[PDB]
Design an enzyme around this catalytic site. Structure first.
Site, short mmCIF file in Angstrom:
data_model
loop_
_atom_site.label_atom_id
_atom_site.label_comp_id
_atom_site.label_asym_id
_atom_site.label_seq_id
_atom_site.Cartn_x
_atom_site.Cartn_y
_atom_site.Cartn_z
N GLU A 1 6.04 17.85 7.63
CA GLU A 1 5.30 17.73 8.89
C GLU A 1 6.25 17.58 10.08
OE1 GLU A 1 3.00 14.24 7.98
OE2 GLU A 1 1.48 15.41 6.90
N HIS B 1 2.58 5.42 10.30
CA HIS B 1 2.16 6.77 9.92
C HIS B 1 2.22 6.94 8.40
CE1 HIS B 1 1.83 11.20 10.04
NE2 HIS B 1 2.96 11.22 9.30
N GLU C 1 4.74 11.38 -1.03
CA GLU C 1 4.40 11.48 0.38
C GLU C 1 5.63 11.75 1.23
OE1 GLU C 1 1.10 12.03 1.86
OE2 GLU C 1 1.30 12.23 -0.33
N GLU D 1 -0.79 5.36 6.73
CA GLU D 1 -1.98 6.18 6.86
C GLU D 1 -2.08 7.18 5.71
OE1 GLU D 1 -2.93 8.59 10.59
OE2 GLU D 1 -4.30 9.18 9.01
N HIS D 2 -0.95 7.79 5.30
CA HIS D 2 -0.91 8.68 4.15
C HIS D 2 -1.25 7.94 2.85
CE1 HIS D 2 1.10 12.40 5.85
NE2 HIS D 2 1.08 11.55 6.88
#
Lengths: 402, 124, 438, 402, 124
Positions: free
Chosen positions: C129, C49, C122, C52-53
Site C-alpha cells: 500500500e 493503521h 499484514e 486497523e488491519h
C-alpha cells in the site's frame, strides 16, 4: 522456376528476356508465427535499416545510383522483401540481402524514430478502406491466435526492441529463408547466394505456437471511415474447389460502368455497394469470405441478405455454363497471381519453404456443377458463421439475422 | 570540434605505446584538477548541448539515463549557486564517470558525416 | 427540525450518543475514538493503521473466517478508518441486527488476537500500500502538505508510517498503543437511524463496561504546532495534470474564528469543469477560472484539528502554461477577503452554508459520522439552532479582520505535483499574498 | 410514500422530521425509450438550461442563495432530476421543475458549448472504470436495442438539437412525469404541483420501439486503461430469486482488509481482482451479471473460471446457512436502496409510472436452499451466455472457454 | 453602445405611432444614402466584431450563415480596393438585408448583463 539449394538456402530462379530482374527473399516469418502481436510487421519495416557493413542511408543512396526499387510486405505466412533492378546489378542485391539477414544492428532509435512510425502510417492507410478492417476482424474471430493474430502492428500492443531482436534471431536463419529470382539466370544466382549466405545461422523452423483452431462469432468495429461487412466461413478442410467458388460468386464488374453477371454482383443492383468473394487457403485451414462495402448501412444490410441467399442457391444448383465460367475466371485469377511479382514470390516461397508444389494456371482443375454445389452447400451448412461489421455497427446485420 | 574527432584522435594515442605512456597519466591528472567530479558531474554532462546533433543524441538516451542526467545538472547547479562542493556519495567516483552519451553522439555524427560525403558523390 | 441527540455516560466514562430516525429500516452503530496517528511517536509511527488491519484478522474467540461469516450472516457491513486524530469503527446493519453488530465491535476492540503470524501477513499488505498511494494524487498532495506545514511535528507524520517502522512493529507496541489510547473516556459509542437510545445504553453496559479509564481524564477534544512556510515540489513531466495545494495555518475546532473561517472558505468555494452548474457560480475565482480555462477543478478547504488547522485550496489543471495565472488569480481572490469583501459576498456565503451544514447529513452513516465527530472534537452535538446562530453572528467585519490576521501577507505551505515547471518559486507565490495597491 | 394525483401528474411524498427535503422528477425517458442513441443522456444534461422565465445563470445564482443542490442522472428506464433544499423552500423548487418541463428553450449554442461537453466528460469519467464499460457492453450484446441502447451519448453517434427537441416533446408530458418528495409534506406538494404542472401537455406514454429480444455473443473492447470481464446471462422471466442469488454469490467484502465468505469473493483468493454479482430487473426482461475487474488479464481469466464453477456449485445445492445469508444480505440491499435518494426516487418512480408496486425491505422473501439452487441451475444452463471483455482482450477468456 | 440599447430604443420608437411615422421614413432614406448595400453588404456585416461578446456571437452563427458572411466581406473588400460598386445580383436588395446576427448578439449580451447584475445582488 528451377528450384535448387545453395549453401543450405533454397533458391528458385527463372531466366527471362528483359532488362529488369526482381530478387525476393521470402521469410517464414509472417504473422501466424509472430511471438508478440505486430512483430512480423515491425521486422518487415526493419529490413534495410542500419547494418554493420552499410547504413540505411548509404544503401538508399546507392540504390538510387542503380535506379533500383525496394518493396516489402508482411502476410499471415511470410515476410517478403523484394528488389527490382537491372539484370547486371544482381551481385549488389544479393550482398544487400545478406547484410540484412546477418548484420542488422537493431537500434532502439531506429525503432522509435524510423520503423514504428512507418509501421503506423502503413496501417492507417490500409484501414482507410473499411473492407480491409472487416476482413482482418473476421480472421481474428475465426482463428483467435496464429492466423487470427493481427498482421500489422497496433498502438494498443507495443512491440519492443527485444521482441523484434528475438523474432529476428529465429527468422533470419537458413531454415526460414527462400530466395526467388525473376528474370535472373539460375546458375548465377546459386553461385552468388552460395557465397553470400554461407555464414547465415542454420537456426530451426519457426512454428506456430499452438494448433490452428476454428471459431464462429461477431466482430463489431465502430469506425467512421465508411461501412463494410464480411460474411466469413472458416474451412477445416482446405480444398481448391473454393477458388472456383469464389471466382464464380464473383462480385466485381468485368467491364467499366457495369455490374457484372456474377451472382454477388447481381445482389448490388440498385445500391451503391460493392461485394467480393475471396478464398484464403492457409494450408491447414481456409477462409471463405464475402465482403460487402458501401456508403449506406441499410444498402449493405440488403446486399448481405442477398449474398447468403446466393450461396444457398449455388448449393442447390449450378449450371454447366456457370461451372465453365467458374473455371475460366479461376484459371485467369491463377495466371495473373503468378505474374504479379508480390504474389509470385510468395507462391514459390510457399513451395520452397513448405513443400506445397505450386499449381500452374494451366493445371487448374475444372470443377463440375455437382462439385461446386457440394462446396457451396458445405458453406451454407457451416456451424461456425463469422460476421465482422465495420462502421455504423448498430445499423449493420448480425450473424443471427443472416 | 566534433566528438568524432576527439574520439578518433584519442584512439590514435591509446594505440601508440609511447604516446599512451606519456598522455594517459597527464589526462588523469588533468581530470583530477578539472574538479568537475567535485560537483557530482560525469564528464559527458559538460558537453555543449545546444546543437542539432547533440539535441538528437540527448533525445535518444534511455529514459533512466536521461532522468539521472537531469538530476545531476540540477544538483550541480545547486552546488554552484551555494558555493559548495559535493561530499560523500555526491562526489563522482572514477568508476562512476561513464561515457553514457558518447555512443549516441558518435552514431548521430556518423550519419551526419556520411550524409555530407554522399551529398558530394560523383558517378564514375 | 431533526430529533434530539440523546447522550448518556457509563461509569468508566464511555459516552453513548444516539439520534433516532423512524423512516429508515437500517441503522449505523459504531465507536468513535479520540485517538489517531498523532498519538504515535516516530518509532511506532504507523501503529494505529497497523491495528486497523489486525482488528479484522481474528479475535480471542472467533477466527478470521468465523468473523467474516458472522458479519455476512448479519447481512450488513463493517467499516473502519484511521486519521491523524480520530479512529472510527462502525457497523451498518439492519434494525434487528444492531445488537449482534455491537457485540462484534466490542470484541475486535477489546480482545483482538494480534497473532504474530497475522502481523507478518499484514506487513506485506501494508508494504504494498505504501508503494500504491502514489496513484491517489490528492492524497499524495495532502500528505506532503501536512509533512511540510508541520515539519518534524506529530501532525506532519503520515498515517501509514515509514517502511522502517512497518518492518519493526511488534505485538507489544500494538498492545501498548491501544491500551494507552483506547480508553473509555476517549471513546464515544454512537448510534444513528433505527436505534433506541435506551437499548444502546444497555448494550454498552453489557459489552463496554470493562474498558480501562485513563489515569488523567481530560475532556473530549483536548489537544504546540508551529506552522512552517515552505514548499514541496514533486515535478513529473509525464503527468498531464498538475495538482497544487496552497494553505496557511487555519483554525482549530474550538477556535472563536471557526465559523468565520468557514464563511471565508465558502466565498472562494469549489469549482469543477465537469459539473454543468459550475460555470454559473457566483464566486469570483470560479468565474475567472471557467472563463479562461485555467483549471479542471479547485476545492477550498478549512481542515481543523484540536489545536491548529490548515485553510487553503487544492487546484488541478492541464493548462501547464497558465499555472502562473491560476495561482495569481487565486491569491488575488484571497487578498480580497482582507481588502474588499462586503455584506454582499458574506451574506451570500452564509446563505449557502446555512443549508450546506444540514445538507451534509444525508444517510444514517452521515448522521453517525456527524454525531461522532462533534462528540470527539467538541465534547457535544451542537444543535442546528446553535449553529444557525453562530453563522448569523459572522459579519463582513469579522471576515475582513480574520483574513487580515490569517491570510494577508502570511507564509504559505505549497505543494505541487506533476507538470509544474510553470509554478514560480516560493517568493513570487508568497508575494501574491498581499497587494501593493492596498 | 403516499401516492396521489395532482392535475394529472402522479405525486408521491413522505413527510419526515428533518430540515432537508429532496424533490425528484422522475421521467419515463431513459435510454430504452431513446429515439436516437444518447438522446436521453443529452436530455438529462439539458435540464436547468435556459428556460423562458429563468436563465440557467439566474437559476444557479438563486439555487446558491437557498443553498440547494441539483443532481441528475439517466438510467435505462428513467431520467431522474433531483433537488435537495431546506423544507421551507419547496415552492421555489416545484416552480423550477415546472419551468424546465414547460419552457426549456433548446438552443443550439447550449447543446454545442454546454450540454454536449458535459455529457462527454460524464462518460469519460465513468469509463475510467473498466468494469462500467464491461457491464455496458454486456447489455449491448444481450439486448441489442431497447435495453441494449447505450445509456450515455458517444462521439460516434452525434445527437442533434432536433433529436433532443423531439424526444423532449414526447417525454416532457403529464403521462411520463412523476414527482417524488422525500421529507415533503404530502398535502402541500399536491397543492403546488397541481398549480405549477397544470398547463403541461398531456402527451402520450413513450414506448420502446420494438419488443425486447434476447441474444448471446461476445464484445471485445480494447482499452489501455485496465482490465475487466463481465459474464452476463439474459433472463426472459425476471424473478426476485435472482436478487437473493446475486446477494449470495456476492463478490465484495463486508469488512476492511478481507476477501469475504461469499462464493465469488472466495474465487479471487490469491489474486488482486474484484468480483460483483449483479441482477438487473427490467420488467419484461432481466440480466444476471458477474463482473470481474483486475490488473492482470491472466488473474481475471483464473477468477473467471472459478466464478463459473461457483455458479454451477450453487446450482447443485446450497445449505440452510447459505440460504439465510442470501436473504439477510438481500434484505439489507433492499433497505439501503430505498434509503439512498438516488435509487429511492427511481423505485417509487417505477411504481408511479409503470405500476410495479414497491417491495418493502421488510417484505423481502426468504428463499429456501431449494429455490436458490434451482435459480443458479437455470443460469448455468443458459442457451445465450454473454461475455464482455475490456482491456487486453487477447488475454481475457472467451465465451466458449467458459 | 450595446446592441441591446440600440434594439430597445428602436422598439420604443416603433411603438409610438407619432415617432414611427416620422422616424421610419428618415431611417429608410438614411440607409439608402449610407450605400452599404451597393457593396453587397447586409447591415449586420458592418457591426464592430473585435469584442469578446461579438466574437462569441459570431462563433454561434449557423455554418451556412457564417460562410456566406465570409464571402460578403471578401467580396466587399474586393469592390473597395477596385473602387467599384456591386451591380446586378451583388447589390443587396432591401428584402435580403436580414438581421441574421442580431438574435445571437442579443442573447450573448443578455447573459453578460444578467451576470453583471447578479454579481451585485444583495441578500435582503
Amino acid at each position: 522456376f528451377s528450384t535448387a539449394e545453395a549453401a543450405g538456402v533454397k533458391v528458385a530462379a527463372q531466366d527471362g528476356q528483359s532488362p529488369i530482374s526482381d530478387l525476393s527473399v521470402v521469410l517464414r516469418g509472417g504473422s501466424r508465427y509472430a511471438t508478440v502481436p505486430g512483430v512480423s510487421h515491425i521486422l518487415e519495416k526493419f529490413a534495410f535499416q542500419n547494418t554493420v557493413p552499410k547504413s540505411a542511408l548509404r544503401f538508399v543512396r546507392e540504390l538510387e545510383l542503380f535506379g533500383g526499387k525496394l518493396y516489402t510486405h508482411t502476410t499471415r505466412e511470410h515476410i517478403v522483401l523484394r528488389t527490382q533492378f537491372l539484370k547486371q546489378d544482381l551481385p549488389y542485391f544479393v550482398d544487400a540481402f545478406a547484410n540484412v539477414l546477418k548484420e542488422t544492428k537493431f537500434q532502439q532509435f531506429e525503432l522509435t524514430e524510423r520503423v514504428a512510425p512507418v509501421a503506423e502510417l502503413d496501417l492507417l492507410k490500409r484501414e482507410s478502406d473499411p473492407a480491409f478492417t472487416a476482413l482482418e476482424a473476421a480472421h481474428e474471430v475465426a482463428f483467435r491466435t496464429g492466423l487470427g493474430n493481427s498482421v500489422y502492428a497496433q498502438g494498443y500492443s507495443p512491440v519492443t526492441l527485444e521482441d523484434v531482436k528475438e523474432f529476428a534471431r529465429q527468422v533470419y536463419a537458413k531454415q526460414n529463408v527462400a530466395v526467388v529470382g525473376n528474370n535472373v539466370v539460375p546458375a548465377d544466382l546459386q553461385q552468388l547466394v552460395g557465397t553470400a549466405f554461407a555464414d547465415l545461422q542454420e537456426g530451426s523452423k519457426v512454428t506456430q505456437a499452438g494448433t490452428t483452431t476454428l471459431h464462429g462469432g461477431e466482430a463489431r468495429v465502430r469506425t467512421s471511415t465508411g461501412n463494410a461487412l464480411t460474411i466469413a466461413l472458416p474451412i477445416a478442410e482446405p480444398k481448391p474447389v473454393y477458388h472456383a467458388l469464389a471466382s464464380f460468386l464473383g462480385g466485381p464488374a468485368s467491364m467499366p460502368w457495369s455490374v457484372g453477371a456474377s451472382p454477388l454482383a447481381q445482389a448490388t443492383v440498385g445500391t451503391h455497394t460493392s461485394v467480393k468473394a475471396t478464398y484464403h487457403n492457409y494450408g491447414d485451414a481456409g477462409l471463405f469470405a464475402i465482403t460487402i462495402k458501401g456508403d449506406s448501412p441499410a444498402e449493405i444490410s440488403q446486399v448481405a441478405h442477398k449474398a447468403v441467399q446466393a450461396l444457398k442457391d449455388t448449393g442447390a444448383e449450378v449450371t454447366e455454363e456457370q461451372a465453365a465460367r467458374a473455371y475460366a475466371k479461376s484459371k485467369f485469377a491463377a495466371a495473373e497471381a503468378f505474374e504479379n511479382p508480390d504474389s509470385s514470390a510468395s507462391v514459390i516461397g510457399m513451395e520452397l519453404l513448405s513443400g506445397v508444389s505450386r499449381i500452374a494456371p494451366e493445371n487448374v482443375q475444372k470443377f463440375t456443377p455437382a462439385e461446386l454445389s457440394e462446396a457451396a452447400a458445405q458453406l451454407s451448412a457451416s456451424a461456425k458463421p463469422v460476421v465482422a461489421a465495420v462502421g455504423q455497427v448498430h445499423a449493420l446485420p448480425f450473424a443471427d439475422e443472416l | 570540434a566534433s566528438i568524432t574527432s576527439v574520439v578518433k584522435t584519442s584512439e590514435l594515442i591509446l594505440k601508440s605505446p609511447l604516446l599512451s605512456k606519456i598522455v594517459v597519466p597527464l589526462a588523469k591528472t588533468y581530470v583530477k584538477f578539472s574538479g568537475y567530479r567535485q560537483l557530482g558531474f560525469k564528464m559527458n554532462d559538460l558537453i555543449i548541448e545546444e546543437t542539432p546533433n547533440m539535441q538528437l543524441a540527448l533525445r535518444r538516451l534511455p529514459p533512466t539515463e536521461s532522468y539521472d542526467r537531469v538530476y545531476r545538472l540540477i544538483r550541480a547547479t545547486q552546488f554552484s549557486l551555494s558555493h559548495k562542493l559535493a561530499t560523500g556519495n555526491d562526489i563522482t567516483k572514477p568508476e562512476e564517470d561513464d561515457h553514457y552519451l558518447i555512443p549516441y553522439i558518435l552514431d548521430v555524427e556518423a550519419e551526419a558525416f556520411e550524409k555530407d560525403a554522399l551529398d558530394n558523390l560523383e558517378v564514375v | 427540525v431533526s430529533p434530539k441527540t440523546r447522550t448518556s455516560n457509563l461509569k468508566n466514562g464511555l459516552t453513548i450518543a444516539s439520534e433516532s430516525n423512524p423512516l429508515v429500516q437500517t441503522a449505523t452503530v459504531g465507536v468513535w475514538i479520540d485517538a489517531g496517528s498523532r498519538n504515535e511517536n516516530a518509532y511506532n509511527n504507523g501503529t494505529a493503521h497497523f491495528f486497523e488491519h489486525l482488528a479484522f484478522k481474528g479475535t480471542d474467540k472467533r477466527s478470521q473466517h468465523q468473523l467474516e461469516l458472522d458479519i455476512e450472516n448479519m447481512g450488513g457491513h463493517l467499516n473502519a478508518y484511521t486519521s491523524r486524530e480520530s479512529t472510527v469503527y462502525y457497523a451498518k446493519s439492519f434494525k434487528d441486527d444492531v445488537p449482534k453488530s455491537v457485540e462484534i465491535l466490542a470484541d475486535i476492540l477489546q480482545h483482538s488476537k494480534l497473532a504474530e503470524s497475522a502481523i507478518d501477513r499484514e506487513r506485506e499488505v501494508i508494504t504494498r500500500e505504501l508503494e500504491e498511494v502514489n496513484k491517489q494524487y490528492e492524497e499524495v498532495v495532502f500528505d506532503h502538505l501536512h509533512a511540510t506545514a508541520f515539519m518534524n511535528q506529530p501532525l506532519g507524520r503520515t498515517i501509514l508510517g515509514p517502511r522502517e517502522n512497518i518492518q519493526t512493529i511488534t505485538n507489544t507496541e500494538l498492545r501498548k498503543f491501544i491500551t494507552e489510547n483506547y480508553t473509555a473516556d476517549r471513546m464515544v459509542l454512537v448510534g444513528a437511524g433505527a436505534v433506541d437510545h435506551d437499548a444502546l445504553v444497555e448494550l454498552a453496559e453489557k459489552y463496554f463496561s470493562h474498558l480501562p479509564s485513563s489515569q488523567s481524564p481530560v475532556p473530549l477534544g483536548t489537544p504546540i504546532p508551529n506552522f512552517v512556510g515552505s514548499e514541496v515540489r514533486l515535478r513529473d513531466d509525464t503527468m498531464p495534470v498538475a495538482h497544487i495545494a496552497i494553505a496557511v495555518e487555519g483554525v482549530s475546532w474550538t477556535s472563536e474564528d471557526y465559523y468565520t473561517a468557514l464563511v471565508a472558505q465558502a466565498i472562494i468555494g469549489n469549482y469543477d469543469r465537469a459539473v454543468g452548474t459550475s460555470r454559473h457560480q457566483g464566486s469570483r475565482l470560479s468565474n475567472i477560472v471557467s472563463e479562461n480555462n485555467l483549471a479542471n477543478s479547485f476545492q477550498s478547504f478549512s481542515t481543523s484539528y484540536s489545536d491548529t488547522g490548515l485553510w487553503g485550496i487544492y487546484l488541478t489543471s492541464e493548462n501547464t502554461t497558465q499555472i502562473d495565472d491560476l495561482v495569481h488569480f487565486t491569491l488575488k481572490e484571497w487578498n480580497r477577503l482582507s481588502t474588499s469583501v462586503s455584506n454582499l459576498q458574506v451574506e451570500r456565503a452564509k446563505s449557502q452554508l446555512k443549508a450546506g451544514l444540514l445538507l451534509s447529513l444525508d444517510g444514517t452513516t452521515y448522521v453517525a459520522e456527524d454525531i461522532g465527530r462533534q462528540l470527539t472534537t467538541l465534547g457535544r452535538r451542537v444543535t442546528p439552532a446553535e449553529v444557525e446562530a453562530k453563522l448569523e453572528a459572522v459579519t463582513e467585519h469579522d471576515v475582513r479582520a480574520w483574513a487580515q490576521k490569517t491570510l494577508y501577507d502570511k507564509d504559505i505551505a505549497l505543494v505541487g505535483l506533476g507538470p509544474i515547471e510553470g509554478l514560480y518559486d516560493y517568493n513570487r507565490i508568497r508575494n501574491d499574498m498581499s497587494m501593493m495597491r492596498w
